[model samples]
Structure formats: structure tokens, C-alpha cells
Target: AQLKGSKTEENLKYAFAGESQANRRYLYFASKADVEGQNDIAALFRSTAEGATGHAHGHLEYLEAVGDPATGLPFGTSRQNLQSAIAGETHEYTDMYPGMAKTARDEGFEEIANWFETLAKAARSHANRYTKALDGLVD
Candidate 1:
């Protein structure tokens, strides 16, 4: 539940958006699925969606709580807002969560490291789809 200092808000926003999208993706994937395992993963997504929603809400609140008017990005995420979400999975796989995982492992907390590692994998798998769904079309 703790964020890494190496984690940037731009990356965090993408993670937030990506998790939200994964929640929906799992739901949709579940809807089209006929396999028990798919259903199970769907349920997994549902459970994680709840967590991710809560997580995103927390991030938003944190951004607002300490927001800087000069940046105008709840957390200096202004530049990456466009397609920011698209890169979420990559960041998770390549950076953010990995830092958490490494930190956890370094601290000898294998459970925590494993948990974030799982998250990173899921986010990577669903990243492009999320990008297309979220950042592609604009209103």
C-alpha cells in the first residue's frame, strides 16, 4: 500500500488508470469467457478492481491533499496525462512496482515483493489494451 520514492506521479496516474481498466477488462473478459479458469481470473479481477478503485481513490485524494497549483496535475502528472495511462503497464513492469518489489525483497519481505510482482505482470499483459481503450479516443 506504500508507494516507492522512485515512483513518480505521472507513473502513478498511469497505474491508477491501468488498474481501473484491468478491472473492467477482466469483467468483459469474464463475460465472454466459457472456461472456469477465466471465470476465476474474472473474479480475481473483480476483487482486485475493488482494491484498485480504492487505491486510485487514495491516490487522487493524496494528490488533492498536497496538490501544487503551479503544476496543476494533482501530482505533476500534467505532461503525461495524454497517453499517460497507456504507459502504465510498462512503468509497472519496468519501474514503479519493481522498485517496490526490490525494496521488499531487500527488506526480506518476500510476500510483499511477490504481491507487487504479480501486479506488475498483470499490468503488463493488459497495458496495450488499456491504452487503446482509455487513451486512444478523445472527446
Candidate 2:
């Protein structure tokens, strides 16, 4: 079925893309943290990043969403990757996901809207952590 006709479906696809990117991005951050000797923090990053992956998988399980996970941008220094991650998450929270959520609400996709809203908050939280991680990096 061509379920992609609706705004909610489109947003769900975007959400999956965002989540997939975040999962890989977090792992990259985790590796950097480990190299920087933030062992526990690295573990947190790794796990939470996997959480994003799990959510993306769930989103895909719904009909009409299909795509391979993104490879994300070329790897840079940990600091640069942190900056990139921060920007991506900020965009999601401040623009992409919010717009999608509103569209979903207007279309009466309450559950989808609620999920997007929740994911939007998660993006904000991820942006904050990325900022902190960048700060901790000794430039």
C-alpha cells in the first residue's frame, strides 16, 4: 500500500532517518569518549545511541517505511562530529520533528504525533549532551 500519501507517513520516514543517523553518531561519540578516558560516559553514549536504533526499527516496522540506515557524514575529529551531531539534533527539535508533529495532529494521527513529540524531546536532550561532549573536548 502507498501509505506515504499522508503527512504522518512522511514524518515517520523522516523520524526513522533521523533516528538512524543518531544511532551511528552516538556510537562514534562513544568511541571518542572511550579514547578520552570517559569510560562510563562512553558506555552511556553507546547504549543510548542503540536506543535510537531500536526506536528507528520500531518506526520501520510500521507499514510503508523502508530504507537502509544512513551512513551519516564522513568521520571527523570527535569534536567536529559532536558539533555536527549537535546541529542535527537541534534542527530536528527546533524544526523538522515539530513541524511533522503538528501536521500529524492536524491530520488526526494522534499516536504518531505523540511519538514524534516524544522523539523531539529526545533530540533536544541529545543536542545538550553533544554540546557538553564538545565542551569537554580539549581543543
Check candidate 1 and list the clashing pairs: none
- Which candidate leads in TM-score? 2
Candidates in order, TM-scores: namely 0.38, 0.49
| RMSD to the hidden true structure, all candidates | 10.8, 13.8
For model 1, the run of ten residues with the poorest summed lDDT:
67-76
Residue 122 displacement in candidate 2 (angstroms): 0.1
Question: Which regions of candidate 1 deviate over 4 angstroms?
Answer: 1-82, 132-139
Task: Report how far residue 63 has shifted in candidate 2, in Å.
Answer: 31
What would the per-residue lDDT of candidate 2 be over residues 12-41, giving only the tens digit for each residue?
778888898899999999999989999998
